[PDB]
């Protein structure tokens, strides 16, 4: 019997195997249906009895992962979000906290999820060179908007938000000014990336990167860089208020910024945006997906 | 004893100088596998430098040595590199190159931790 049962399991499983890949081929060009940051790394290992062998994705913490379908409870169908890396097998959260207390148990070692929620295009927020809201940093973003709406035409959605998105005490500062607009407006930001079109937000409470670092809004974050105090207070001419947070933006430790655009010439630095963004295009549109 | 790590380039330079490390692994191909250093000085506990992903594409790096210190890593060659700029005195230490267990699910944590790491180099003197 143990060995009758072993070759009816073998042709199920080998039938399977089949199946699953065929359902695989056919996620190559479905829509996106949400995307996920990691907060763990994943290395499939053979005893993991994915769908099809061989075909489970590897990410890194911090990777941003595109779900296409749900296979099962313990496995779901996606790509990570770089150039070169095509549909594959995605651990579901039940199946990753299995396997990570299998492993504590094989190493003699509550945790946080595996995953967040984040829209499928990270948003575009730009800080610098000093406050919004005044006329020099005003009018330096929407040149860096007008360049990008004309370079990216058709493939990029700007939109305001003047709702305080970093109340995403706090407690005060909801009090002066409603969650329910300000999820509302998170949720409209995940709805404009939904078709993978580039989103930029003027966002007008942002002046700083620490204001949205623990949303799940994910954004990339350009940093339009004057680094000469005096250039600044000749375009300038509240001086003040102004040069303190140019001088805070400059403090802030680098990996803080997606783009630091330091750039002595303005069309240079919209340039370098642009290779940027073109770059994070082809991650996110690879070529199987477009058939 | 299949795996080996040798390490190079250590020694003692002035404070405000450079210095360059390398660690060569031989015994496994280690692709799936972080690549780090860590530094203990006398009469300190061991203490995490900076390591990288198995891929290269993500450095973690302790705030000690932030902007100071780049590491690099060719897998072809199964080798690390840790270039060291700007030494100060509180650097003196000697320096162990290690390479990451086989993690199946890992946080960042476990870059910096140093019971996470399998292998392990003899050292390598750096002083001030």
């Known amino acids: 019997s143990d060995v009758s049962l072993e070759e009816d399991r073998e042709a199920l499983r080998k039938e399977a195997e089949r199946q699953a890949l065929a359902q695989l081929e056919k996620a190559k060009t479905k829509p996106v249906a949400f995307a996920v940051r990691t907060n763990v790394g994943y290395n499939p290992s053979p005893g993991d009895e994915v769908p099809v062998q061989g075909v489970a994705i590897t990410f890194e913490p911090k990777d941003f992962l595109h779900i296409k379908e749900k296979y099962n409870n313990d496995w779901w169908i996606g790509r990570l979000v770089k150039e070169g890396c095509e549909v594959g097998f995605i651990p579901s959260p039940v199946k990753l906290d299995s396997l990570r207390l299998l492993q504590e148990q094989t190493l003699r070692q509550e945790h946080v999820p595996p995953y967040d929620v984040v829209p499928s295009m990270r948003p575009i927020i730009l800080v610098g060179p000093s406050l919004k809201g005044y006329e020099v940093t005003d009018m330096m973003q929407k040149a860096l908007f007008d360049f990008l709406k004309h370079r990216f035409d058709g493939r990029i959605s700007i939109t305001r938000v003047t709702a305080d998105i970093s109340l995403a005490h706090i407690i005060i500062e909801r009090s002066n000014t409603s969650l329910a607009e300000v999820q509302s407006e998170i949720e409209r930001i995940f709805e404009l990336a939904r078709t993978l079109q580039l989103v930029a937000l003027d966002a007008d409470t942002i002046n700083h990167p620490a204001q949205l670092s623990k949303t799940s809004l994910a954004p990339i974050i350009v940093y339009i860089k004057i680094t000469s105090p005096k250039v600044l207070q000749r375009l300038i001419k509240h001086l003040n208020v102004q040069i303190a947070a140019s001088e805070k933006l400059a403090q802030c430790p680098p990996e803080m910024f997606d783009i630091i655009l330091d750039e002595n010439q303005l069309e240079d630095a919209c340039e370098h945006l642009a290779e940027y963004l073109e770059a994070y295009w082809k991650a996110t549109h690879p070529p199987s997906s477009t058939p | 004893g299949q795996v080996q790590l040798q390490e190079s380039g250590g020694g003692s330079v002035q404070a405000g100088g450079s210095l360059r490390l390398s660690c060569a692994a031989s015994?496994?191909?280690?692709?799936?596998?972080?690549m780090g250093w860590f530094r203990q000085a006398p009469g300190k506990e061991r203490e995490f430098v900076v390591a990288?992903?198995?891929?290269?594409?993500?450095?973690y790096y302790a705030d000690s040595v932030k902007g100071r210190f780049t590491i690099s890593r060719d897998n072809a060659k199964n080798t690390v590199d840790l270039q060291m700029n700007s030494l100060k005195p509180e650097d003196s230490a000697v320096y162990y190159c290690?390479?990451?267990?086989?993690?199946?699910?890992?946080?960042?944590?476990?870059?910096?931790?140093?019971?996470?790491?399998?292998?392990w180099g003899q050292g390598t003197q750096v002083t001030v």
């Open positions: 015994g496994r191909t280690f692709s799936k596998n972080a």
């Open positions: 990288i992903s198995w891929s290269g594409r993500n450095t």
């Open positions: 290690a390479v990451g267990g086989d993690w199946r699910v890992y946080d960042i944590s476990f870059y910096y931790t140093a019971h996470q790491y399998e292998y």
